[PDB]
Each structure stands twice: as C-alpha cells, then as structure tokens.
Design a protein around this ligand. Structure first.
Ligand SMILES: CC(C)[C@H](Nc1ncnc2[nH]ccc12)c1ccc2c(n1)S(=O)(=O)CCC2
Length: 169
C-alpha cells in the first residue's frame, strides 16, 4: 500500500516519469516523501506549492510559517523536511533556482542533490514552468544527480511527450 506508484515509464534504474498532477499522485500513492517546488520563505502562493498547500487545507502554510519564524529562510539549492500532512509521511521542500528572477541555473544540481537523503520520492520537475529553466535540461540534471528512487509527476501531456522523446533519442 505504501509507495504504490502506477503507470510510470522507467527512464533509468532509479528515475520514473508520468503525466500526472503531483497532488493526485500523492492521494493515490501515499508516498513516504512528496517533494514541493518551494521558494526560500516557503510562501506557497501558486503553481505546484499552492496546489500541494490547498490539498492540505492550508495546514502546510501554517507549519511553514512557524518553521521560517524559528529557522529563517532557506537558501536557493537548499531544503527542509516538514510534515506531509494528508499527502505523504514527509514533505521535502526544495528550492530550485528561479532563472526568470536571475538565480543561477548551476544551483539546480544542488537542488536535486537534496533528494539523495530519501530512499523513495514523488517529485515535480524542479525549476520548470514559471521558474524558467529548460525542462529538458532539468530532467537531464535529475537523471545525472539523483541516485535514490525518484518518481516524477509532470502535469502536462505535451511536455511529458517532449521529455520522453528527448531522453530516448
Ligand atoms: C511544468 C509544469 C507542468 C509543472 N506543473 C505541475 N507539475 C506537477 N503537478 C502539478 N500540480 C499542479 C501543477 C503541477 C511545474 C513543475 C515545476 C514547477 C512548476 N510547474 S511552477 O510553474 O509551479 C514553478 C515551480 C516549479
């Protein structure tokens, strides 16, 4: 029953991908860890973070505000482990670089390295969408950097097909 991932395409021995909303996956799978595509003040105002927070009925945001009060903001490329609420045992909040805001694309390697502290994770494609990184480059960084078992959920069939085609060429 735990980590019941289904319908994924295996890309490498440790990286799997699916066309799916990460919130819907977290409900079906009940993963040990769900990754959030966070910002440094853990303000979950939209996109992936806003969807995961809404699915917890704002409990994630209240917990996040209390973590920031005590520990201060994260650094770009860094992470913290908080509760997964009804979505997972734990949420790994990871800050990838926001290239549209001038942050260094090289920090995407540091961001994916946080996944290596967890044996199995359900995650989004870091720094893609409105963070502005090239999503084919984000997938290449994930495959080359993550060594633990990562199940990527990408909520867009057009991007999913472009990512699989580019990996398999
Ligand atoms: C590329 C896009 C399809 C993808 N969205 C998603 N991928 C998987 N489950 C999802 N549920 C709701 C949206 C959503 C995606 C991945 C990463 C990032 C963003 N968006 S962003 O624009 O929210 C900025 C943070 C980085």
């Amino acid at each position: 029953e735990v980590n019941s991932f289904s319908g994924y395409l295996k890309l490498t021995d440790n990286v799997y991908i699916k066309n799916a909303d990460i919130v819907e996956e977290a409900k079906k799978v009940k993963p040990t860890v769900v990754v959030n595509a966070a910002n440094v003040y853990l303000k979950h105002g939209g996109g992936v973070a806003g969807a995961l927070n809404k699915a917890t009925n704002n409990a994630m945001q209240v917990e996040s505000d209390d973590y920031i009060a005590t520990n201060g903001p994260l650094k770009v490329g860094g992470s913290c482990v908080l509760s997964g609420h009804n979505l997972a045992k734990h949420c790994l909040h990871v800050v990838g670089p926001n290239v549209n805001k001038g942050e260094d694309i090289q920090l995407l390697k540091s961001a994916y390295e946080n996944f290596n502290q967890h044996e199995v994770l359900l995650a989004p494609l870091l720094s893609a969408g409105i963070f502005g990184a090239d999503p084919i480059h984000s997938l290449r960084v994930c495959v080359d950097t993550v060594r633990t078992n990562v199940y990527l959920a990408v909520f867009d069939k057009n991007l999913y097909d472009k990512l699989v085609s580019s990996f398999l060429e």
